[PDB]
């Protein structure tokens, strides 16, 4: 790319991943505020990590207003700098600091509609995210919200083949992953967004489990223990046990009480057991829940 480190002035640290540090920086020539992710190619006898190779290859291709833009990659022999569009906050920090009495319903609806746009675009370009959670959703001052953190993402074939099972932060992880299924698909991202939608209403995780089996149990206790009727094949799945307690499905009115009829409908469709019946991002955009969202479409970045 056309960038050199000399042209950026570091401003402060803003994060640290298991693969380096992010600084807020300023482009001294254009004025652009950016986020610089440092990926030490050293401190590693295996060369460029796979997380970085997928993040760059995939993000180079994904230009959408609700996907954080990769602006540049500065490739020293020693270090690797990913230059990203900068957004001031994440959805987790907003809910924990300013959304204490709650995120108002117009804003929730705007955010969800944007997340769906971003996600539909990923899926349309054969990219699974595989780590949708509030910490990985950046918000700016203009009220845009954008999928970020593509270091767990993956380019899929059609139909999909078996991919990595250690995927998705637990609280956001789809039942088909938890039950050890051979194949998973776009429906795992939709689940995570389901979890997130609910979380934005209540400001607390829907399924905060402390192990795989506890996670499943919390899901079952809310949505009912799935059987062949609701989810054909479920009982043949590798980590499905006959011994699973059989809990009853609870009315979604009791799962997220403040939510209206349209909301409850969309939510149930995102959290459908059968990944085959779970709504797609593309379909979800036309759900009546979004009828009165009028926030102008964010513009894509250069």
């Amino acid at each position: 790319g056309p960038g050199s480190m000399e042209n950026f002035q570091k401003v402060e640290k803003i994060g640290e991943g298991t693969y380096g540090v992010v600084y807020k920086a300023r482009n001294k020539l254009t004025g652009e505020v950016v986020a610089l992710k440092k990926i030490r190619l050293d401190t590693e006898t295996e060369g460029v990590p796979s997380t970085a190779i997928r993040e760059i290859s995939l993000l180079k291709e994904l230009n959408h207003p609700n996907i954080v833009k990769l602006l540049d990659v500065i490739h020293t022999e020693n270090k690797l700098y990913l230059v990203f569009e900068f957004l001031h906050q994440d959805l987790k920090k907003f809910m924990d600091a300013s959304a204490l009495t709650g995120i108002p319903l117009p804003l929730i609806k705007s955010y969800l509609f944007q997340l769906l746009q971003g996600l539909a675009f990923c899926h349309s370009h054969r990219v699974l995210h595989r780590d949708l959670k509030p910490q990985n959703l950046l918000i700016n001052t203009e009220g845009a919200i954008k999928l970020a953190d593509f270091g767990l993402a993956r380019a899929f074939g059609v139909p999909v083949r078996t991919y990595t099972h250690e995927v998705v932060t637990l609280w956001y992880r789809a039942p088909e992953i938890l039950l050890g299924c051979k194949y998973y698909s776009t429906a795992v991202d939709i689940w995570s967004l389901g979890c997130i939608f609910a979380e934005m209403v209540t400001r607390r995780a829907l399924f905060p489990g402390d192990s795989e089996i506890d996670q499943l149990f919390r899901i079952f206790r809310t949505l009912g223990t799935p059987d062949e009727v609701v989810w054909p094949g479920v009982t043949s799945m590798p980590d499905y046990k006959p011994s699973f307690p059989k809990w009853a499905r609870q009315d979604f009115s009791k799962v997220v009480p403040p939510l209206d009829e349209d909301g409850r409908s969309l939510l149930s469709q995102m959290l459908h057991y059968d990944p085959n019946k779970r709504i797609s991002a593309k379909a979800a955009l036309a759900h009546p829940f979004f009828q009165d969202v009028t926030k102008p479409v964010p513009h894509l970045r250069l």
């Binding site: 295996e46 291709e61 054969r126 074939g157 059609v158 698909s185 776009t186 085959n276």
Partner: protein
């Protein structure tokens, strides 16, 4: 259902069609390589077929690595003593992209029989990333094959394996296959496979999806049929060995048809 992404398969197909064009190697770069030939390339790819089986790698990884090699050799001149090093790095990169469990860099060094150092593999890794500008999510023959497979009435595993086999044979021979896009070779491979196993031809539904006809596929199809007929005579045999395995339904043992009637 969702595993075949009903709501996205067309979007994806269309996108892979656009991308296979951007990721396409220069058809005539071998003449511009002073010191390497199609034959040397064939030897490298055949070796990468053996490395893929030794490490139980995905076939996709194999196709990606070939794509990287061909794009690299399109802008960078390489001495014959270094071609293997390019190939090794290509395979490393593709493994890191495509595999759940990529082999460690040390194993990539080990399969070169200490021709090259770990430092040389890693430095070449960097060079290849530079040259390709990290543009690694390339459409492969396989990405098209698996989609075309959804058009079998009904699914036949020998058809699928045979199509995979033919596709892989095409990686070996820069002439003529450098001149055909992944999507077209896959079309040819699928029709040949279908004709060979069941007597059937390229389905109309795939004419609708792809805009390709037996008309448009004909040139490639004639080349593929020849490659199939001469496969037992080729200098490079690693793919036929591989496809004897039950994993792939021993499809390399099927007899090619003598004529296509096309």
């Amino acid at each position: 259902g969702v595993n075949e992404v009903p709501d996205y398969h067309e979007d994806i197909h269309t996108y892979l069609r656009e991308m296979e064009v951007k990721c396409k190697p220069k058809v005539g770069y071998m003449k511009k390589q002073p010191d390497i030939t199609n034959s040397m390339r064939a030897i490298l790819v055949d070796w990468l077929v053996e490395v893929g089986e030794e490490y139980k790698l995905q076939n996709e990884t194999l196709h990606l690595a070939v794509n990287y090699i061909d794009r690299f050799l399109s802008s960078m001149s390489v001495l014959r003593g270094k071609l293997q090093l390019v190939g090794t790095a290509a395979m490393l990169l593709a493994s890191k992209f495509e595999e759940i469990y990529p082999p460690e860099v040390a194993e990539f060094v080990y399969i070169t029989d200490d021709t090259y150092t770990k430092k040389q593999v890693l430095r070449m890794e960097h060079l290849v990333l530079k040259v390709l500008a990290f543009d690694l999510a390339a459409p492969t023959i396989n990405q098209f094959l698996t989609q075309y497979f959804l058009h079998q009435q009904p699914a036949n595993c020998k058809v699928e394996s045979l199509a995979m086999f033919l596709g892989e044979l095409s990686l070996i021979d820069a002439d003529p296959y450098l001149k055909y896009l992944p999507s077209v070779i896959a079309a040819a491979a699928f029709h040949l496979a279908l004709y060979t196993v069941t007597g059937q031809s390229w389905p109309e539904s795939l004419v609708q999806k792809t805009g390709y006809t037996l008309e448009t596929l004909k040139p490639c199809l004639l080349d593929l049929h020849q490659t199939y007929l001469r496969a037992p005579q080729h200098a490079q045999q690693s793919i036929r060995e591989k496809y004897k395995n039950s994993k792939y339904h021993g499809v390399s043992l099927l007899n090619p048809p003598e004529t296509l009637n096309v």
